[PDB]
Amino acid sequence: MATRTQFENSNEIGVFSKLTNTYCLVAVGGSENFYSAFEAELGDAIPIVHTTIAGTRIIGRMTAGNRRGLLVPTQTTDQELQHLRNSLPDSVKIQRVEERLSALGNVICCNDYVALVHPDIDRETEELISDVLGVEVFRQTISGNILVGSYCSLSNQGGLVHPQTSVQDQEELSSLLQVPLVAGTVNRGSSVVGAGMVVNDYLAVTGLDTTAPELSVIESIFRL
Secondary structure, X not given: OEEEEOEOOEOOHHHHEEEOOOOEEEEOOXXXXXXXXXXXXXXXXXXXXXXXXXXXXXXXXXOEEOOXXXXXXXXXXXXXXXXXXXXXXXXXXXXXXXXXXXXXXXXEEEOOOXXXXXXXXXXXXXXXXXXXHOOEEEEOXXXXXXXXXXXXXXXXXXXEEOOOOOHHHHXXXXXXXXXXXXXOOEOOOEOOHHHHEEEOXXXXXXXXXXXXXXXXHHHHHOOO
Protein backbone atom coordinates (compact mmCIF):
# COMPACT_ATOMS: atom_id res chain seq x y z
CA MET A 1 0.00 0.00 0.00
CA ALA A 2 0.78 3.72 0.22
CA THR A 3 1.52 5.43 3.53
CA ARG A 4 2.34 8.90 4.79
CA THR A 5 5.05 9.98 7.24
CA GLN A 6 7.56 12.70 7.96
CA PHE A 7 11.23 12.95 8.86
CA GLU A 8 10.89 15.40 11.75
CA ASN A 9 8.35 17.77 10.22
CA SER A 10 9.54 17.28 6.63
CA ASN A 11 7.31 15.59 4.02
CA GLU A 12 10.18 15.01 1.61
CA ILE A 13 10.64 11.32 2.27
CA GLY A 14 12.69 10.93 -0.88
CA VAL A 15 15.34 13.14 0.70
CA PHE A 16 15.91 10.88 3.74
CA SER A 17 15.22 7.46 2.25
CA LYS A 18 15.97 5.27 -0.76
CA LEU A 19 13.67 2.37 -1.62
CA THR A 20 14.15 -0.38 -4.20
CA ASN A 21 12.60 -3.80 -4.70
CA THR A 22 15.44 -5.54 -2.85
CA TYR A 23 16.43 -3.02 -0.16
CA CYS A 24 15.62 0.14 1.78
CA LEU A 25 18.02 2.81 3.00
CA VAL A 26 16.98 5.23 5.73
CA ALA A 27 18.77 8.11 7.46
CA VAL A 28 20.52 7.09 10.70
CA GLY A 29 18.86 9.59 13.02
CA GLY A 30 15.16 9.16 12.31
CA SER A 31 12.29 8.71 14.76
CA GLU A 32 10.19 5.59 15.34
CA ASN A 33 7.20 7.08 13.52
CA PHE A 34 9.44 7.53 10.46
CA TYR A 35 11.13 4.11 10.57
CA SER A 36 7.86 2.30 11.27
CA ALA A 37 6.41 3.67 8.05
CA PHE A 38 8.71 1.17 6.37
CA GLU A 39 9.18 -1.52 9.00
CA ALA A 40 5.40 -1.87 9.32
CA GLU A 41 4.91 -2.87 5.69
CA LEU A 42 8.33 -4.22 4.68
CA GLY A 43 8.64 -6.32 7.81
CA ASP A 44 11.34 -8.98 7.51
CA ALA A 45 10.80 -8.87 3.73
CA ILE A 46 13.75 -6.70 2.67
CA PRO A 47 16.76 -5.19 4.53
CA ILE A 48 16.18 -1.75 6.07
CA VAL A 49 19.69 -0.27 6.27
CA HIS A 50 20.26 2.81 8.43
CA THR A 51 23.10 4.92 7.09
CA THR A 52 24.81 8.19 6.37
CA ILE A 53 26.41 9.14 3.05
CA ALA A 54 29.49 11.36 3.10
CA GLY A 55 28.55 12.05 6.71
CA THR A 56 25.17 13.53 5.83
CA ARG A 57 21.69 12.16 6.51
CA ILE A 58 20.05 13.23 3.23
CA ILE A 59 20.83 9.74 1.89
CA GLY A 60 17.88 9.83 -0.53
CA ARG A 61 19.34 12.71 -2.55
CA MET A 62 22.94 11.54 -2.09
CA THR A 63 22.41 8.14 -3.69
CA ALA A 64 20.76 6.47 -6.66
CA GLY A 65 20.15 2.82 -7.41
CA ASN A 66 17.79 -0.07 -8.00
CA ARG A 67 17.60 -3.78 -7.14
CA ARG A 68 20.91 -4.60 -8.86
CA GLY A 69 23.09 -1.74 -7.72
CA LEU A 70 23.59 1.40 -5.69
CA LEU A 71 25.61 4.45 -6.71
CA VAL A 72 27.25 6.59 -4.06
CA PRO A 73 29.29 9.80 -4.24
CA THR A 74 33.09 9.66 -4.03
CA GLN A 75 32.95 11.30 -0.60
CA THR A 76 31.21 8.21 0.78
CA THR A 77 33.50 7.13 3.62
CA ASP A 78 34.97 3.62 3.69
CA GLN A 79 33.11 3.01 6.94
CA GLU A 80 29.75 3.82 5.37
CA LEU A 81 30.68 1.72 2.33
CA GLN A 82 31.72 -1.27 4.45
CA HIS A 83 28.51 -0.93 6.44
CA LEU A 84 26.49 -0.89 3.21
CA ARG A 85 28.23 -3.88 1.62
CA ASN A 86 27.60 -5.87 4.81
CA SER A 87 23.92 -4.95 5.18
CA LEU A 88 22.75 -5.12 1.54
CA PRO A 89 22.38 -8.44 -0.31
CA ASP A 90 25.40 -9.74 -2.26
CA SER A 91 23.61 -9.45 -5.60
CA VAL A 92 23.68 -5.64 -5.39
CA LYS A 93 26.79 -3.79 -6.57
CA ILE A 94 27.86 -0.66 -4.69
CA GLN A 95 29.93 1.71 -6.78
CA ARG A 96 31.33 5.16 -6.07
CA VAL A 97 30.59 7.63 -8.84
CA GLU A 98 32.46 10.84 -9.52
CA GLU A 99 30.07 13.41 -10.96
CA ARG A 100 29.63 17.01 -9.86
CA LEU A 101 26.51 18.16 -11.70
CA SER A 102 24.45 17.72 -8.53
CA ALA A 103 23.65 15.04 -5.93
CA LEU A 104 23.42 11.59 -7.47
CA GLY A 105 19.77 11.34 -6.43
CA ASN A 106 18.87 14.43 -8.48
CA VAL A 107 20.91 13.50 -11.53
CA ILE A 108 19.67 9.92 -11.84
CA CYS A 109 16.14 8.52 -12.09
CA CYS A 110 15.65 4.79 -12.47
CA ASN A 111 13.74 1.58 -12.03
CA ASP A 112 15.03 -1.93 -12.75
CA TYR A 113 14.93 -1.46 -16.53
CA VAL A 114 15.66 2.11 -17.56
CA ALA A 115 17.38 5.17 -16.13
CA LEU A 116 17.24 8.84 -17.08
CA VAL A 117 20.34 10.94 -16.47
CA HIS A 118 21.19 14.63 -16.32
CA PRO A 119 21.51 15.67 -19.99
CA ASP A 120 25.03 17.06 -19.45
CA ILE A 121 26.51 13.88 -18.05
CA ASP A 122 29.69 12.60 -19.73
CA ARG A 123 29.81 9.41 -21.75
CA GLU A 124 32.22 7.55 -19.46
CA THR A 125 29.87 8.15 -16.51
CA GLU A 126 26.73 7.25 -18.45
CA GLU A 127 28.28 3.88 -19.29
CA LEU A 128 29.27 3.28 -15.67
CA ILE A 129 25.69 3.89 -14.57
CA SER A 130 24.30 1.54 -17.20
CA ASP A 131 26.94 -1.00 -16.23
CA VAL A 132 26.47 -0.95 -12.43
CA LEU A 133 22.67 -0.67 -12.56
CA GLY A 134 22.50 -3.05 -15.51
CA VAL A 135 20.01 -0.73 -17.14
CA GLU A 136 19.51 1.24 -20.36
CA VAL A 137 20.47 4.88 -19.84
CA PHE A 138 19.07 7.93 -21.59
CA ARG A 139 19.96 11.59 -21.14
CA GLN A 140 16.69 13.43 -20.70
CA THR A 141 14.91 16.39 -19.16
CA ILE A 142 11.52 16.25 -17.48
CA SER A 143 9.51 19.34 -18.42
CA GLY A 144 12.80 21.13 -19.01
CA ASN A 145 14.45 20.29 -15.67
CA ILE A 146 17.87 18.68 -15.85
CA LEU A 147 17.52 17.24 -12.34
CA VAL A 148 15.59 14.20 -13.54
CA GLY A 149 15.87 12.26 -10.28
CA SER A 150 14.25 15.20 -8.55
CA TYR A 151 11.23 15.54 -10.82
CA CYS A 152 10.37 11.91 -11.40
CA SER A 153 9.34 9.08 -9.10
CA LEU A 154 9.64 5.70 -10.79
CA SER A 155 8.98 2.01 -10.19
CA ASN A 156 8.52 -0.90 -12.58
CA GLN A 157 4.76 -0.38 -12.38
CA GLY A 158 4.36 3.27 -13.30
CA GLY A 159 5.79 6.72 -12.76
CA LEU A 160 4.93 10.28 -11.79
CA VAL A 161 6.49 13.36 -13.40
CA HIS A 162 6.52 17.13 -13.07
CA PRO A 163 2.89 18.40 -13.25
CA GLN A 164 3.67 20.61 -16.23
CA THR A 165 5.19 17.87 -18.37
CA SER A 166 3.36 18.02 -21.70
CA VAL A 167 1.24 15.06 -22.73
CA GLN A 168 3.64 14.57 -25.61
CA ASP A 169 6.61 14.09 -23.31
CA GLN A 170 4.51 11.89 -21.06
CA GLU A 171 3.65 9.63 -23.98
CA GLU A 172 7.25 9.51 -25.18
CA LEU A 173 8.60 9.00 -21.66
CA SER A 174 6.06 6.24 -21.00
CA SER A 175 7.38 4.41 -24.08
CA LEU A 176 10.97 5.08 -23.10
CA LEU A 177 10.58 3.88 -19.51
CA GLN A 178 8.15 1.10 -20.43
CA VAL A 179 5.65 2.16 -17.74
CA PRO A 180 2.58 4.40 -17.59
CA LEU A 181 3.60 7.98 -16.73
CA VAL A 182 1.32 10.73 -15.47
CA ALA A 183 2.05 14.34 -14.56
CA GLY A 184 1.16 15.00 -10.94
CA THR A 185 2.07 16.51 -7.59
CA VAL A 186 2.94 15.19 -4.18
CA ASN A 187 2.84 16.58 -0.61
CA ARG A 188 0.06 19.04 -1.40
CA GLY A 189 1.17 20.80 -4.57
CA SER A 190 4.89 20.04 -4.71
CA SER A 191 6.14 19.35 -8.23
CA VAL A 192 9.31 17.74 -6.84
CA VAL A 193 7.76 14.27 -6.92
CA GLY A 194 11.21 12.71 -6.99
CA ALA A 195 12.21 14.05 -3.57
CA GLY A 196 8.77 14.01 -1.96
CA MET A 197 8.22 10.26 -1.96
CA VAL A 198 9.96 6.91 -2.27
CA VAL A 199 8.42 3.94 -4.05
CA ASN A 200 8.95 0.41 -5.30
CA ASP A 201 6.73 -2.31 -6.78
CA TYR A 202 4.83 -3.00 -3.57
CA LEU A 203 5.02 0.08 -1.36
CA ALA A 204 4.98 3.85 -1.65
CA VAL A 205 5.88 6.18 1.18
CA THR A 206 5.04 9.87 0.86
CA GLY A 207 4.63 12.82 3.24
CA LEU A 208 1.73 13.38 5.64
CA ASP A 209 0.63 16.40 3.63
CA THR A 210 -0.15 14.47 0.42
CA THR A 211 -3.82 15.21 -0.34
CA ALA A 212 -6.49 12.58 -0.97
CA PRO A 213 -6.44 13.17 -4.73
CA GLU A 214 -2.63 12.99 -4.82
CA LEU A 215 -2.58 9.73 -2.88
CA SER A 216 -5.25 8.36 -5.21
CA VAL A 217 -3.08 9.03 -8.27
CA ILE A 218 -0.13 7.40 -6.49
CA GLU A 219 -1.78 4.09 -5.53
CA SER A 220 -3.41 4.10 -8.95
CA ILE A 221 -0.35 4.71 -11.16
CA PHE A 222 2.07 2.65 -9.08
CA ARG A 223 -0.66 0.02 -8.80
CA LEU A 224 -0.73 -0.29 -5.02
